[PDB]
Structure formats: structure tokens, C-alpha cells
Amino acid sequence: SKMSDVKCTSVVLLSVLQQLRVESSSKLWAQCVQLHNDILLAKDTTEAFEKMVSLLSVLLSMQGAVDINKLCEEM
């Protein structure tokens, strides 16, 4: 299960972004929604992984939103 692991990770990622009030910036939320919906409607795993990279770059670009070091040290 790798195609279906990507489609659920994108759901969780967009839930995190919505919790981080990315929804307030309409231009960014439109791109996040487009990437999420195109990951869900995907047949190829490489396209889904590229769109997952693009969608995770939204989370990684906001410095003050999440603590990457603390989150990645719990693993």
C-alpha cells in the first residue's frame, strides 16, 4: 500500500494546513486545494509524490507555524 498511503497523507497534510489558517490566504488555499484534489484523483504514484512535495512545501515555507525540529524528534 503506497498509492493509498499518499492519498491519506495528503488529507492529513491539508487538515494541518487548514488548522494553521492557510485558509485565510485565498491564493495559497486555492493551490493547496488543487494539489490535494489532484493527489486524491491520481492513478500514478510519481505524480502524486511530486504534488505531495509541492503541498508539503506550503507547510515547510511558514517558519513560525510548526516546530519541525520537535515534530521530527518524536520519530
Binding site: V12, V53, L56, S57, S61, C72
Partner: protein
């Protein structure tokens, strides 16, 4: 069942069992049958209120558990979702996702959405020469498991800095962090 009314009913039942083991005749036998019935009825009323009380106990237990768990789960919704997201990210073990996450830990985060179209623009902040040495080889920039052509390096003063000025000796006087704009190759 370790209750008083059951003690009364049980001793009446034992007395009737002994009597019917004897069971000669007849009025004592019928009176003991009636005594057994009248004790059993009170024991049964006590058992019925016992069961009503324990049913309400189970109602209270279930309701309180539902309330406590619901409020606990609704309280911790951000941190739980973020931990779940990073657990799922680690489980995928994609090389591009791991690369961008490891760079984000060092502080080499992007400034915009990483683009998918060829010859598209990526702006990424590099906070020290360590993150520059691994990622940038010559004019090439390795990021997100992809190769990019470095176009424009600026500082926090927005001053253009040539790729020749990034070195072990001149950069310790520069205005770090650099911001590198590159194009997807």
C-alpha cells in the same frame, strides 16, 4: 448474592428443602410454601431495585467516559494531527520528501510552493555555508530530489552576490542568510 434479602430467601428455601425432605403432612408444608413465596417476593423486589441501580451506574459510567474522551480528543486536535502527519510522512520514506524535511530541519526552507513545471522558479533561503556546501555544486542546486540551475543569490539586504563570493573566507562577512532563486532543470 451477598445481600440481606437473599439471606432471608436462602434460609427460607433451605428450611423448605429440609421440610420437603421430611414432608410428612401438610399444613406446615403449605405454610412453609407461603413463607418461601413471601420471602422470595421481597428478595425479588430488592434484586429488582439492585438491578435498576446498577443499570443507572452503567449509564453514568458510559456517559462520563464518552464526555471525557470526546473533550480530550477535541482539545488535542492540532498537535495530534501534526504528529500523525509527520508519522505518516516518515512511513512513506520518499527521497524527495525526506530531502525537503531534512533541509527544513536545518533551516533551508523554501519561500514559495515548490514548482512542478520545467523551468519554473524556486526561491529557497540558505542560513549557513554548511547547507550551501552540500546542496549547491557549482551553478547546480540539488533540492527535492531534483536538479535546479542557480539564477540569483541575494542577501537580507537584497544585494546581489555572485556565486564566486560564497566561500569559507568571504561569506563569514556576508549578510547571511542567503536567498537563492533557481529554475527547474
Amino acid at each position: 448474592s451477598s445481600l440481606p434479602s437473599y439471606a432471608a430467601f436462602a434460609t427460607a428455601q433451605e428450611a423448605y428443602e429440609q421440610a420437603v425432605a421430611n414432608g410428612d403432612s401438610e399444613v406446615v408444608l403449605k405454610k412453609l410454601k407461603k413463607s418461601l413465596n413471601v420471602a422470595k417476593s421481597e428478595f425479588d423486589r430488592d434484586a429488582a431495585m439492585q438491578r435498576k441501580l446498577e443499570k443507572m451506574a452503567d449509564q453514568a459510567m458510559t456517559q462520563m467516559y464518552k464526555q471525557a474522551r470526546s473533550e480530550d480528543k477535541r482539545a488535542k486536535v492540532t498537535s495530534a494531527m501534526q504528529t500523525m502527519l509527520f508519522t505518516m510522512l516518515r512511513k512513506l520514506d520518499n527521497d524527495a520528501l525526506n530531502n525537503i524535511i531534512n533541509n527544513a530541519r536545518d533551516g533551508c526552507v523554501p519561500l514559495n510552493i515548490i514548482p512542478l513545471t520545467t523551468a519554473a522558479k524556486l526561491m529557497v533561503v540558505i542560513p549557513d555555508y554548511n547547507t550551501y556546501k552540500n546542496t549547491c555544486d557549482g551553478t547546480t542546486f540539488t533540492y527535492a530530489s531534483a536538479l535546479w540551475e542557480i539564477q540569483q543569490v541575494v542577501d537580507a539586504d537584497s544585494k546581489i552576490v555572485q556565486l564566486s563570493e560564497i566561500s569559507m573566507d568571504n561569506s563569514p562577512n556576508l549578510a547571511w542568510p542567503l536567498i537563492v532563486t533557481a529554475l527547474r532543470a
